Design a protein around this ligand. Sequence first.
Ligand code: NAG
Ligand code: CU
Length: 227
Amino acid sequence: HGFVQNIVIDGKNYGGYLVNQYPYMSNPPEVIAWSTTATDLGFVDGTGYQTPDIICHRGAKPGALTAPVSPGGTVELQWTPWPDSHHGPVINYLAPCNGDCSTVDKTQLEFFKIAESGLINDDNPPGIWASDNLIAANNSWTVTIPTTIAPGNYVLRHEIIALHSAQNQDGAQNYPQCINLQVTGGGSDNPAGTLGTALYHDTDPGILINIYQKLSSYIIPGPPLYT
Ligand SMILES: *[C@@H]1O[C@H](CO)[C@@H](O)[C@H](O)[C@H]1NC(C)=O
Ligand SMILES: [Cu+2]
């Protein structure tokens, strides 16, 4: 359980969607982060993979604001303290807004994977995962925006998948957090995109899995990494 509290881009903080404050306020502030109704600081499980909730979390609506990123620049997402128990991958996707991200129809967004990290070491099951790298970095993740993509406005869909309960059907816990970016530079790729509701299926090999046994491999879920 947790959420993205802050985003650091080009030397400033863009406050996140503080899901334990703003839903209680009813004139809440404009941010680059999508609003959600996930006030339990919880997840979307396999029962919601083909519902709109998987796209940018439960009841999500676009952020009003968009943050510019320098070409090949970094976006640092700062989480609330991630529990060690919640082992799993950290995955990052972009989807083009083709206009102002604040007015997009999330159900039409087509995402391409720009980064993925999974099982890092398995010397002591359940092992060390991307989520453990995030904890070791004091609960932050650095995303590098590719220089090869067409610039414009994009949703960044940043996600941890916790696998501590994933040996049961619908046990994997997805924690997507979306932010609005203005990608800048000289690139031209328009990578093939995947609807939010086709990223994951509740029987995928990196989703329905017992992490407590020795693992020979881990197949990071979602569509193929763009390079
Ligand atoms: C996180 O930062 C705090 C100090 O702000 C430190 O006490 C803690 O050990 C840090 N680093 C790691 C690797 O967790
Ligand atoms: Cu949790």
